[PDB]
Design a protein around this nucleic acid. Structure first.
Ligand code: MG
Ligand code: MG
Ligand code: MG
Ligand code: MG
Ligand code: MG
Ligand code: MG
Ligand code: MG
Ligand code: MG
Ligand code: MG
Ligand code: MG
Ligand code: MG
Ligand code: MG
Ligand code: MG
Ligand code: MG
Ligand code: MG
Ligand code: MG
Ligand code: MG
Ligand code: MG
Ligand code: MG
Ligand code: MG
Ligand code: MG
Ligand code: MG
Ligand code: MG
Ligand code: MG
Ligand code: MG
Lengths: 104, 88, 66, 70, 272, 117
RNA sequence: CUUGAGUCUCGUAGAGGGGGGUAGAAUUCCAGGUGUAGCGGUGAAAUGCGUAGAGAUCUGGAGGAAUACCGGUGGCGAAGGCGGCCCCCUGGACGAAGACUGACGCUCAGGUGCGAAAGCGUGGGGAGCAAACAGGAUUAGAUACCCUGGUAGUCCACGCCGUAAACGAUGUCGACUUGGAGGUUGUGCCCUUGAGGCGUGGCUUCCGGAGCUAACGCGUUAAGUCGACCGCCUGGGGAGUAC
């Protein structure tokens, strides 16, 4: 199992849908025997440059140990869900559980 | 590349001892397994010439080793190539 | 001066926008290693981090109005 | 090279900051270089020449110019 | 695969077959067949209304499902088949409730594959969903023009359409001709490109092949006598005329679209 | 007829020519002037002085609108790039912000070939 | 037998290769707003574009190609070559301690593979650039240089071609022979007291001793002292041409 690190930015008008979404993604990972090493809702945040003409995207961070098939499925879900503006699944070597600088 | 556990299993199978890694038979077996594994990759990626260079090197090493076995000990050579199902 | 020397930084983090802002100029461009004094390995790591942040709109690509 | 003129900043002073900012950014140099396509070989050759000249000049100054000129 | 036939005769030397071994070597599903007698390009007055049509092979008509209305019930692709009535290949599918149906085969599609029409249907090749549901940018085929009418656009081999935009009730389609066209977003559209893409790589190799496909020989207007064609015929090979159809209307470059009812839907006319 | 008080001066300063364009803060152009129209051709319109008189002309043109504050956006490598802003200030606007917006690609389209002179 | 050669364990750095996504800047085009006589170009002009509203400026859209800064006589690769970010597949190099095999090695005529750019075939794509081509200049002429345009091509898939000043103008492998200053990447000890002290490997740049060289220069990455094998040369032209 490969340690990943997903960060996805959500449309701020759909910020209320975010708790359910987090639950769904985590649930899928667990269902597929995926561990969840850190989970940080960073919330609404000011973009450094306007994406799709809209500012203030809602950032969610998720460091996960999962299989790659499930990572692929998650990526596909991200791409087709017209809610997540950006995503960034990024491989990591170890269990990076400590809290991130943005929460710090 | 070949995973650690798989490599260990190969070593145990053909290795006189589980700390034996240099034995000719073990070396040949490891090369063969690697080559077999890489077949799928090269079927997918026919233009991966650099990687195929690596594969070719593996093949050459196996041939050289096999030849060494043939001259040294014929029975071992015959048994090994029957076990592995390698032509000549 | 090479900030990471006191740590011997274990790994540069693209989310650490606080420090990456030391390694980007006013216009958003990456500062040369010769000017900031970063070690070469670390400089490469930082550049990668900056690029990732830019992708995630944590840092800006350029100093323009928005 | 964005500049905003501060309260009670003279215009000439503002201009000076703007010019300095532009020079630091290196906008004019970038544009001039990107005016025409330099071939990759040309770019490599120029880089090599620059490196050689710089090194040679530095060596000459520091080590060769440690003697009595008069 | 494409296969160059060896030159054992001057009839085979230029032939290029497109051979697909995945097709069904067998008889088609008899409930979906029906009679399809030939016209010879003649209308109900018995007159030749389209030249150069005649003869060829007998052909049963497969009843292909362009409407794609079994919403929700998931089907599975049993087998790919040869359809003589179209460039594309068809696919015999089996709906969970027991109904079988022919559909156009999309790209990559094969036996045992699972497909589903509907709104909830997953975005994957061979699935069919209203074009408001399909992501903008997606390549689609068998596209409907009037909601519920049945796919009309991009039915031919390797064809497809780009959903370039969705503004309200209309999606903008970049059609295979290059044409941009507004279509209602309620119009159905099957994901992916239509299969047998190598169809165009085939080379008939002889006159007989065309004949087998029912295409009778074309006679050049300039071969004819002045009474027969506006290109008449002179002593030797003269021409001196501006090119024209047999019925005397300039050919090559003169536009003929006469349709003010539908111009509102044409966002940009094709180019090149 | 309208008044705006605060404009943007877009100084397009190519090697051959200087275009000055005063606009409302939104983007809509009020008046423009060039060294070419200012009465300079060739060697004379590719100079700082020409740019300055172009700037003066532009200021005069937009005098109707009664523009008081002005932010200047300089573009391109040019002989003016300074003369125009100096002239504008002299003509008597408060220069609030000065920004460079020269469009550098991030290694994009291929430039035209090198001149052999 | 274990010193050459290889295997296993753990790490390390890397534009190494193949496939698939994606980001921002910029050019072009398209539609619209503002707006008015110029723009463009050059040594100076003209062709060209613009009162049928261009250039400038703001908004939106399309599409292709390439990845600013970082960036380095930096790195990787047998060479050709490789440069945004992300994932999937994948080859090699290097260090640490051990353990294992036990000369399994070096080189290689034929042979086989890889091999920039241009070029070719078939099917796509086509923004920018640009052989050919067109017009404008310059000129004695100007089938050029300069200017405005501009098609193959440059891009993608899969085949072919099989060559370059494909150069370090320096065949591969191994051993030995004074130094200095760097770069890069490991690793051992020293309290890292700080970025730091003393070692020990790999690759790499410059300078220089002996020696070598016709000289220029090379100089522990040799063009020095040697061993193995290969490739190649024997005056200029004719000619890397004819058959
Ligand atoms: Mg006909
Ligand atoms: Mg014909
Ligand atoms: Mg005919
Ligand atoms: Mg006749
Ligand atoms: Mg007639
Ligand atoms: Mg005739
Ligand atoms: Mg005749
Ligand atoms: Mg005649
Ligand atoms: Mg005639
Ligand atoms: Mg030019
Ligand atoms: Mg790498
Ligand atoms: Mg290496
Ligand atoms: Mg040979
Ligand atoms: Mg090429
Ligand atoms: Mg071609
Ligand atoms: Mg072509
Ligand atoms: Mg051009
Ligand atoms: Mg030209
Ligand atoms: Mg040669
Ligand atoms: Mg070369
Ligand atoms: Mg040579
Ligand atoms: Mg060799
Ligand atoms: Mg030397
Ligand atoms: Mg002779
Ligand atoms: Mg010859």
């Amino acid at each position: 199992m490969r340690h990943y690190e997903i960060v996805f930015m959500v449309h701020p008008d759909q910020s209320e849908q975010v708790p359910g979404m987090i639950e769904r993604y985590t649930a899928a990972i667990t269902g597929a025997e995926g561990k969840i090493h850190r989970l940080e809702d960073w919330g609404r945040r000011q973009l450094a440059y306007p994406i799709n003409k809209l500012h203030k995207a809602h950032y969610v961070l998720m460091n996960v140990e999962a299989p790659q098939e499930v990572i692929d499925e998650l990526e596909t879900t991200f791409r087709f869900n017209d809610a997540v503006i950006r995503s960034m699944v990024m491989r990591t070597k170890h269990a990076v559980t400590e809290a991130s600088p943005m929460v710090k | 590349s070949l995973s650690t556990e798989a490599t260990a299993k190969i070593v145990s199978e053909f290795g006189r001892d589980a700390n034996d890694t240099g034995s000719t038979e073990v070396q040949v077996a490891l090369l063969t397994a690697q080559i077999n594994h890489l077949q799928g990759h090269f079927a997918e990626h026919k233009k991966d010439h650099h990687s195929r260079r690596g594969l070719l090197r593996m093949v050459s090493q196996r041939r050289k080793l096999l030849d060494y076995l043939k001259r040294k000990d014929v029975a071992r050579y015959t048994q090994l190539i029957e076990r592995l199902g390698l032509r000549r | 001066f090479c900030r990471f020397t006191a740590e011997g930084v274990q790994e540069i983090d693209y989310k650490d926008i606080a420090t990456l802002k030391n390694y980007i100029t006013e216009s958003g461009k990456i500062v040369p290693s010769r000017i900031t004094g970063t070690r070469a390995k670390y400089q490469r790591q930082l550049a990668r981090a900056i690029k990732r942040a830019r992708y995630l709109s944590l840092l800006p690509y350029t100093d323009r109005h928005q | 090279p964005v500049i905003k003129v501060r309260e009670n900043e003279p215009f000439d002073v503002a201009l000076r900051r703007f010019k300095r900012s532009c020079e630091k950014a290196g906008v004019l140099a970038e544009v001039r270089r990107r005016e025409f396509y330099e071939k990759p070989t040309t770019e490599r050759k120029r880089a090599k020449a620059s490196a050689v000249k710089r090194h040679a000049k530095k060596l000459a100054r520091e080590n060769a110019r440690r003697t009595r000129l008069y | 695969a494409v296969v160059k036939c060896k030159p054992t005769s001057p009839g085979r030397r230029h032939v290029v077959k497109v051979v697909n071994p995945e097709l069904h070597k067998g008889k088609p599903f008899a409930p979906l067949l029906e009679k399809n007698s030939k016209s010879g390009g003649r209308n109900n007055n018995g007159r030749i209304t389209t030249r150069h049509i005649g003869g060829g092979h007998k052909q049963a008509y497969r009843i292909v499902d362009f409407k794609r209305n079994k919403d929700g019930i998931p089907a599975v692709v049993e087998r790919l088949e040869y359809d003589p009535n179209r460039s594309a290949n068809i696919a015999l599918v089996l709906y969970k409730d027991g109904e079988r149906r022919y559909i156009l085969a999309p790209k990559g599609l094969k036996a045992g594959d699972q497909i589903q029409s509907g709104v909830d249907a997953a975005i994957k090749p061979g699935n069919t969903l209203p074009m408001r549901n399909i992501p903008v940018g997606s390549t689609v085929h068998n596209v409907e023009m009037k909601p519920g009418k049945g796919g009309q656009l991009a039915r031919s081999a390797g064809t497809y359409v780009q959903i370039v935009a969705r503004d309200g009730a209309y999606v903008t389609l970049r059609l295979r001709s290059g044409e941009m066209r507004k279509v209602e977003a309620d119009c159905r559209a099957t994901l992916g490109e239509v299969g047998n893409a190598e169809h165009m790589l085939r080379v008939l190799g002889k006159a007989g092949a065309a004949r087998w496909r029912g295409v009778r020989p074309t006679v050049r207007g300039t071969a004819m006598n002045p009474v027969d064609h506006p290109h008449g015929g002179g002593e030797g090979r003269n021409f001196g005329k501006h090119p024209v159809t047999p019925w005397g209307v300039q050919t090559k470059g003169k536009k003929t679209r006469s349709n003010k009812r539908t111009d509102k839907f044409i966002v940009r006319r094709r180019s090149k | 007829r309208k008044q705006v008080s605060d404009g943007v001066a877009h100084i397009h300063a190519s090697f051959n020519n200087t275009i000055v364009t005063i606009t409302d803060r939104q983007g809509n152009a009020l008046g423009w002037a060039t060294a070419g129209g200012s009465g300079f051709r060739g060697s004379r319109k590719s100079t700082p002085f020409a740019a300055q008189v172009a700037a003066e002309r532009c200021a005069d043109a937009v005098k109707e609108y009664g523009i008081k504050n002005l932010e200047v956006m300089v573009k391109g490598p040019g002989p003016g790039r300074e003369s125009t802003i100096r002239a504008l200030n002299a003509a008597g606007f408060r220069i609030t912000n000065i920004t460079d917006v020269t469009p550098i690609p991030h290694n994009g389209c291929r430039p035209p070939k090198k001149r052999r002179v």
